Structures are given as C-alpha cells and as structure tokens.
C-alpha cells in the first residue's frame, strides 16, 4: 500500500531545514515518499498532489499544539476529506510507535469489506 509522510517545516526555514528533516524521515522510512510544506498553501498542495498519486496512508511530522500547526490540520483535512488514513507523529520519542500506527492500523480501517 502507498505511504507519504509530509514535515511541518518552520516559519525560518528555507531549502536546507525542509531538506535535512526530510532526510530523516526518509533514513526512518524508506518505504515513503517523503514531502516538505511551510504554509497552507504548500499543505493543500502535497495533501491534493498524494491524493493524485493515492496515498493510501499519509503520516504528517510535526506538532499539534500551537498556532504554527495550521500546515498539518490542513493536509489531514484534505486527505481525510479524501478518505485515506492521515495521522500527525508529535513526537521525537514515540515517534516508531506512532508511525507504524500508519502501516499497522491502515488495515484494521480499510480491510473494512470483502476486497
């Protein structure tokens, strides 16, 4: 099944920040394709671009809990308007548990009927 994770990239950053937290996300999970957003904007796009593709399970790296976490309630909101199965990983130390919640419970909410 089709895996996209998608980072939270800061207010500050610019090419460089966006590009080494992807690097991590893509040593952590090889097996996604790894996206970067710093506005609305950005978040629609790759949010609407992996709908295009069919992401099947989108796992969106950055916090939920300040005015800044806009960019990641957004992709979720477009995905999840989709139907696929988005989750946000706000965390650097539960962070294997809570991505693996993306390629273990996807089947538990999409093995939902006969095929």
């Known amino acids: 099944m089709r895996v996209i994770v998608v980072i939270v990239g800061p207010s500050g950053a610019g090419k460089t920040t ?7 996300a893509k040593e952590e999970v090889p097996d996604a394709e790894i996206r ?5 904007e950005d978040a629609k ?4 671009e992996a709908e295009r593709r069919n992401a099947d399970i989108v796992v969106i790296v950055g ?3 300040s005015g800044k976490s806009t960019l990641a309630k957004i992709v979720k909101k477009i995905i999840a308007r989709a139907g696929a199965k988005t989750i ?3 965390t650097e130390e539960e962070l294997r548990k809570a991505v693996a919640k993306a390629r273990g419970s996807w089947s538990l909410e999409h093995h939902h009927h006969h095929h």
């Open 18 to 24: 966006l590009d080494e937290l992807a690097r991590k």
């Open 88 to 90: 946000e990983v706000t």
């Open 63 to 65: 916090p939920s809990g």
């Open 36 to 40: 970067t957003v710093t506005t609305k």
């Open 45 to 48: 796009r790759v949010a609407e």
